[PDB]
Amino acid sequence: GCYGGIEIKAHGDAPAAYNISINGHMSVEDVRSYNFRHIGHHAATAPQSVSAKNIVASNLVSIRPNNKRGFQDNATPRVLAVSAYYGVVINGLTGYTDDPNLLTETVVSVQFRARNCSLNGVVLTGFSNSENGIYVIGGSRGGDAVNISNVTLNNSGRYGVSIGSGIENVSITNISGIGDGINSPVALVSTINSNPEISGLSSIGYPTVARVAGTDYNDGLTLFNGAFRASTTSSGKIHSEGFIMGSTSGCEASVSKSGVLTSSSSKTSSERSLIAGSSTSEAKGTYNTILGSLGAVADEQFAALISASQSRASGNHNLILSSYGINTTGSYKVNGGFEKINWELDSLNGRIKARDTVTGGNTWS
Amino acid sequence: GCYGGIEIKAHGDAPAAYNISINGHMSVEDVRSYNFRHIGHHAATAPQSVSAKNIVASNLVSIRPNNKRGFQDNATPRVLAVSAYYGVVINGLTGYTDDPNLLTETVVSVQFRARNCSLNGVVLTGFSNSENGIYVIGGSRGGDAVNISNVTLNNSGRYGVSIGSGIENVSITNISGIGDGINSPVALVSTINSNPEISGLSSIGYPTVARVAGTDYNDGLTLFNGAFRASTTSSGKIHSEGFIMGSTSGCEASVSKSGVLTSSSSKTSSERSLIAGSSTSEAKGTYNTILGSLGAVADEQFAALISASQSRASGNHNLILSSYGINTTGSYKVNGGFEKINWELDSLNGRIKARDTVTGGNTWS
């Protein structure tokens, strides 16, 4: 029956409380069950608090948060409100109400310069007329992060987990929600930024499961950021807009939009490129394709090789097929050969050339 | 020396206990150390409990669970048994025994309409003659989830972590196990459903590490569900059977079996398709391939382009190679050109055509 159940803070012109541990608490009909803040250090244009740091809070219970008594000029209720603080770790939180009209804005807020906060093991039940279950707004700062995992929402929040502006680093994993009893539910998960890391969403009764910068995903989502590598035990450099998969050692994909699949000792520094099913191959131009090849090099714009060995395509839009030991240089040509160029399809001039013969009336027996 | 150490429940015709917090407990030689249930709400054909919700339980100790005394008609022992309840969050659980014959069925069970449960930070030691370490059976319900993470098993369970029927949403991460001292171990992890989310498995002494719907994985596994995106900071729509990787903005893979790699502003709505190493390209047919191309469109079944610019392949099995500025329409043709079609390999009729000349006796110097 208080305003704050546990408040951790400071007034302006004072240092905030720091290195505080909550090892279990029960808050019954408070306004803001857990309320961590530092007055004077919330505005985007204020200095960051140099003192608001380190809160570890666990096994937190919040029951029927409300403001029937009118505390703090009818401040809106919260199960949890974090602001200003760096390094808040919340584990095992249950918020429960039996009256949907008591709390109507946000059940859990992480906002107002709060940074590097982590929520894990959360059950929110009964808040069926609140706009937001969890609502996070960032600050927007280097080295920031917000981690939300293992959350389940039972008719709690038109937006179950909402991420607002100013947040570049978010991890949202294993969120589930029931929205059937909610007054006009919108989405289990919603994000303003286009690059959240997301996996393990499950819901019923929300019209949209995930809304990521305006795009809906209702059938499951896995999103990861940065350089990506899978089923490859070691590799050289991978650009943040690149990847290596299903490969053995010695591969690299060192520029924007370059990638290696199913290969050994193969490297691409070619912007817009793919190497697949190959060994000891290298793409160094742009728009390069190397497939099913051995010791193949593509080193000019749009150069490519398919089923080629010990060969180099160095022409503009120059493709080598089904070859061994040839180096080609022509523009808009498809070539094949064996130790020397033996045929050409010349797209530039409309010529077809064989080293030996060109014949019709053939059969294959 | 009790039947239940802590029991949280209700009898039939009563509401179950709700919003209960266990902030550390030690259970010594009980039958079921932690036993959460709601009689009358366990059968598949019973109503779901409307009251069994919210349990957060942490730092739980269970020692030598057994039924030497014969409680409850020789009910089988458990470190933890969850049934009926929604939203059970378990963090930091250690179960320990020095007598393998006391508990022989399942160490931890999540079954009988239990839903949206989460287990994290579990150590089970000494249960070397039990069939299952953790055994989960689902209900099978929309918006359900079971999350199991950071578990280590020391000679505990022929099946370390087993997922049974009725579970569509499972996350199993960071499970490790020693099976050397187990009486006939089978698998560290086992799954009935074909789509578990799994990563971070490590074992010794289990003949199989992971068995996923009957298929064994003994050398590491990472499985994710839904639309997939990596090393791409933003994108348009990705179908749940699609992906975008290593790409920049403006890409989409909007239908079953469509994908974009290493590209910019390129979109596929083509069922069974791939765009790689390309820009401003679009696949709209079926069985479409676009590689290393710029402003390329494939809009008919089996149409494809490789090393092509400002070109459209609109024929049935029509492939364009090494070209600029051509639109082709023929069936079973390979084409090349530069502002006009300049050559054709006609697989349908066995014709080869050049705009200019076709010659043999050529050399490339």
Side-chain angles (χ1 to χ4, degrees):
Chain A
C2 302
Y3 171 62
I6 298 172
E7 172 172 272
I8 303 177
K9 84 163 197 302
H11 300 274
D13 301 326
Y18 62 87
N19 198 46
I20 311 297
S21 162
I22 302 171
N23 189 33
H25 185 79
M26 181 195 287
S27 149
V28 181
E29 294 170 352
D30 295 316
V31 182
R32 300 199 162 193
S33 301
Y34 308 97
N35 190 200
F36 314 150
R37 59 198 182 109
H38 190 189
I39 304 163
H41 299 95
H42 298 139
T45 57
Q48 184 83 36
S49 173
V50 301
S51 56
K53 297 158 164 22
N54 296 53
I55 294 174
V56 177
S58 297
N59 298 291
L60 299 188
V61 183
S62 167
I63 300 147
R64 294 161 44 72
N66 68 89
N67 203 356
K68 288 171 170 181
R69 276 196 66 195
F71 288 100
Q72 295 269 53
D73 292 341
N74 308 300
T76 57
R78 289 283 186 280
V79 164
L80 170 69
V82 185
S83 56
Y85 273 86
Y86 159 94
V88 180
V89 180
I90 308 292
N91 198 108
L93 167 69
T94 173
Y96 188 99
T97 191
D98 54 354
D99 185 341
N101 293 313
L102 302 173
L103 185 168
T104 245
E105 183 189 50
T106 296
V107 190
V108 172
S109 59
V110 181
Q111 296 170 15
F112 300 115
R113 282 190 158 271
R115 49 169 309 163
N116 295 271
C117 294
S118 186
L119 306 169
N120 178 260
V122 180
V123 195
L124 304 176
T125 298
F127 301 89
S128 58
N129 200 24
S130 62
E131 183 75 3
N132 304 293
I134 297 169
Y135 186 28
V136 184
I137 303 173
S140 175
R141 309 149 287 247
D144 199 352
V146 59
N147 306 311
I148 308 177
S149 55
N150 303 312
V151 175
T152 179
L153 301 177
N154 195 121
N155 293 322
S156 297
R158 288 186 268 279
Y159 287 94
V161 176
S162 179
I163 315 295
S165 67
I167 282 144
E168 286 233 60
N169 291 279
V170 210
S171 171
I172 301 159
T173 57
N174 299 330
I175 312 302
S176 61
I178 297 159
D180 290 308
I182 296 174
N183 181 196
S184 305
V186 179
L188 205 228
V189 172
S190 168
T191 266
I192 293 301
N193 70 313
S194 67
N195 62 336
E197 300 189 294
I198 290 177
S199 76
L201 306 188
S202 178
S203 63
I204 185 180
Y206 281 93
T208 301
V209 184
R211 182 161 294 155
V212 180
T215 298
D216 297 354
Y217 287 91
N218 300 321
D219 303 303
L221 232 205
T222 299
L223 310 172
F224 282 100
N225 298 339
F228 182 68
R229 195 182 69 192
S231 53
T232 306
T233 64
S234 67
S235 73
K237 179 63 159 164
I238 309 175
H239 194 269
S240 66
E241 295 168 330
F243 60 77
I244 299 174
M245 305 190 50
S247 292
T248 58
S249 70
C251 297
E252 10 178 292
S254 60
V255 302
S256 183
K257 308 176 287 290
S258 67
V260 177
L261 305 169
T262 57
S263 291
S264 59
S265 306
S266 296
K267 305 169 169 178
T268 167
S269 47
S270 169
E271 195 179 352
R272 301 184 183 86
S273 64
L274 180 71
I275 300 187
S278 292
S279 57
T280 53
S281 289
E282 180 154 23
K284 332 179 179 190
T286 46
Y287 295 97
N288 293 309
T289 307
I290 303 180
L291 303 169
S293 291
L294 180 171
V297 177
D299 62 2
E300 180 58 87
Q301 64 177 29
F302 300 88
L305 305 89
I306 302 175
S307 295
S309 284
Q310 290 295 124
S311 295
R312 178 181 293 251
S314 290
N316 174 17
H317 291 73
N318 181 26
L319 168 66
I320 288 169
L321 302 179
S322 288
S323 287
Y324 170 74
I326 68 169
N327 298 322
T328 59
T329 238
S331 298
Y332 296 95
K333 316 265 189 283
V334 190
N335 287 290
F338 190 83
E339 305 201 347
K340 335 177 70 169
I341 297 160
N342 288 152
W343 59 258
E344 181 167 290
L345 310 171
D346 171 6
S347 309
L348 213 209
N349 304 295
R351 282 164 208 153
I352 293 172
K353 298 180 168 182
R355 184 171 293 277
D356 191 33
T357 60
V358 188
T359 55
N362 286 284
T363 202
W364 279 261
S365 58
Chain B
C2 302
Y3 171 62
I6 298 172
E7 172 172 272
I8 303 177
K9 84 163 197 302
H11 300 274
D13 301 326
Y18 62 87
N19 198 46
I20 311 297
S21 162
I22 302 171
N23 189 33
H25 185 79
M26 181 195 287
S27 149
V28 181
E29 294 170 352
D30 295 316
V31 182
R32 300 199 162 193
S33 301
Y34 308 97
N35 190 200
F36 314 150
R37 59 198 182 109
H38 190 189
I39 304 163
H41 299 95
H42 298 139
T45 57
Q48 184 83 36
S49 173
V50 301
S51 56
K53 297 158 164 22
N54 296 53
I55 294 174
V56 177
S58 297
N59 298 291
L60 299 188
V61 183
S62 167
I63 300 147
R64 294 161 44 72
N66 68 89
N67 203 356
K68 288 171 170 181
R69 276 196 66 195
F71 288 100
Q72 295 269 53
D73 292 341
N74 308 300
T76 57
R78 289 283 186 280
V79 164
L80 170 69
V82 185
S83 56
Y85 273 86
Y86 159 94
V88 180
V89 180
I90 308 292
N91 198 108
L93 167 69
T94 173
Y96 188 99
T97 191
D98 54 354
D99 185 341
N101 293 313
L102 302 173
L103 185 168
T104 245
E105 183 189 50
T106 296
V107 190
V108 172
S109 59
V110 181
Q111 296 170 15
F112 300 115
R113 282 190 158 271
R115 49 169 309 163
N116 295 271
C117 294
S118 186
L119 306 169
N120 178 260
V122 180
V123 195
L124 304 176
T125 298
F127 301 89
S128 58
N129 200 24
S130 62
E131 183 75 3
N132 304 293
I134 297 169
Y135 186 28
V136 184
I137 303 173
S140 175
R141 309 149 287 247
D144 199 352
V146 59
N147 306 311
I148 308 177
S149 55
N150 303 312
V151 175
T152 179
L153 301 177
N154 195 121
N155 293 322
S156 297
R158 288 186 268 279
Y159 287 94
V161 176
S162 179
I163 315 295
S165 67
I167 282 144
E168 286 233 60
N169 291 279
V170 210
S171 171
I172 301 159
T173 57
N174 299 330
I175 312 302
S176 61
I178 297 159
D180 290 308
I182 296 174
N183 181 196
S184 305
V186 179
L188 205 228
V189 172
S190 168
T191 266
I192 293 301
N193 70 313
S194 67
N195 62 336
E197 300 189 294
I198 290 177
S199 76
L201 306 188
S202 178
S203 63
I204 185 180
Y206 281 93
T208 301
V209 184
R211 182 161 294 155
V212 180
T215 298
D216 297 354
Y217 287 91
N218 300 321
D219 303 303
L221 232 205
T222 299
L223 310 172
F224 282 100
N225 298 339
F228 182 68
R229 195 182 69 192
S231 53
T232 306
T233 64
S234 67
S235 73
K237 179 63 159 164
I238 309 175
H239 194 269
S240 66
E241 295 168 330
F243 60 77
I244 299 174
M245 305 190 50
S247 292
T248 58
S249 70
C251 297
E252 10 178 292
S254 60
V255 302
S256 183
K257 308 176 287 290
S258 67
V260 177
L261 305 169
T262 57
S263 291
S264 59
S265 306
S266 296
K267 305 169 169 178
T268 167
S269 47
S270 169
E271 195 179 352
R272 301 184 183 86
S273 64
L274 180 71
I275 300 187
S278 292
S279 57
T280 53
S281 289
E282 180 154 23
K284 332 179 179 190
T286 46
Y287 295 97
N288 293 309
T289 307
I290 303 180
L291 303 169
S293 291
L294 180 171
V297 177
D299 62 2
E300 180 58 87
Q301 64 177 29
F302 300 88
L305 305 89
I306 302 175
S307 295
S309 284
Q310 290 295 124
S311 295
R312 178 181 293 251
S314 290
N316 174 17
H317 291 73
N318 181 26
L319 168 66
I320 288 169
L321 302 179
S322 288
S323 287
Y324 170 74
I326 68 169
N327 298 322
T328 59
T329 238
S331 298
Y332 296 95
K333 316 265 189 283
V334 190
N335 287 290
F338 190 83
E339 305 201 347
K340 335 177 70 169
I341 297 160
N342 288 152
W343 59 258
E344 181 167 290
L345 310 171
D346 171 6
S347 309
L348 213 209
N349 304 295
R351 282 164 208 153
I352 293 172
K353 298 180 168 182
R355 184 171 293 277
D356 191 33
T357 60
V358 188
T359 55
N362 286 284
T363 202
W364 279 261
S365 58

